């Protein structure tokens, strides 16, 4: 179920549903569904809502466990700073302006990689500045 098309057939397969059942429910043809399940074509977001509705799950729950492969895009923020922002428990009090300030920090193409490290930088910087 790691690939999206593999997950789609898994949902149908584990429920023991025939292609026509899912297709008639989703208002789409068996050949189109079959193409989606084989990965020949890529579903649109609207198609995912309908497929997820057929399986009585949310799109977010449908995409659970799905790896999208594809090309890789470098993150806008450093991973440690991004993870800190992503973590609700740690760095929640950090204002958006501070995230921008921290983002500019970088050393010689080398940056500290721990979310905890970025939190300490913020605390020390916030004490000195602001």
């Amino acid at each position: 179920h790691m690939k999206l098309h593999e997950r789609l057939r898994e949902l149908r397969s584990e429920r023991g549903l025939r292609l026509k059942d899912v297709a008639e429910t989703a208002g789409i043809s068996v050949p189109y569904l079959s193409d989606l399940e084989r990965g020949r074509t890529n579903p649109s977001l609207e198609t995912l809502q309908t497929l997820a509705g057929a399986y009585s799950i949310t799109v977010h729950d449908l995409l659970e466990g799905v790896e999208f492969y594809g090309d890789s895009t470098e993150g806008a923020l450093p991973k440690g700073l991004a993870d800190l922002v992503a973590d609700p428990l740690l760095g929640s009090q950090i204002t958006p302006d501070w995230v921008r300030t921290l983002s500019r920090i970088e050393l010689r193409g080398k940056r500290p990689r721990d979310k905890q490290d970025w939190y300490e930088i913020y605390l020390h910087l916030k004490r000195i500045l602001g």
Copy 2:
């Protein structure tokens, strides 16, 4: 409880980034990113994973807490039976043929609607067999 374009706006807004920071990194134009955040147009899956990469999160995590209003499709299975199959802890060993057998059961156009009820039906039916 949140719309997709609202979530995209929130991600950039909480990080304090500018459209151009995300856009140049994402490899998409500032106007297109603006349209995505406004809700004017819908991103493809390929574009969505690019945005997720810009925010250093998974597509699954990006869509956490996002609500889609578009669909009205009914479920292929009963809600209770579907919840049972969806739950990994409950009825993990239930075979697909058993799911199909169970799906045919309905009474007077009504069903129990509870995952626990479906599991108990399965346990007893399996025991008779």
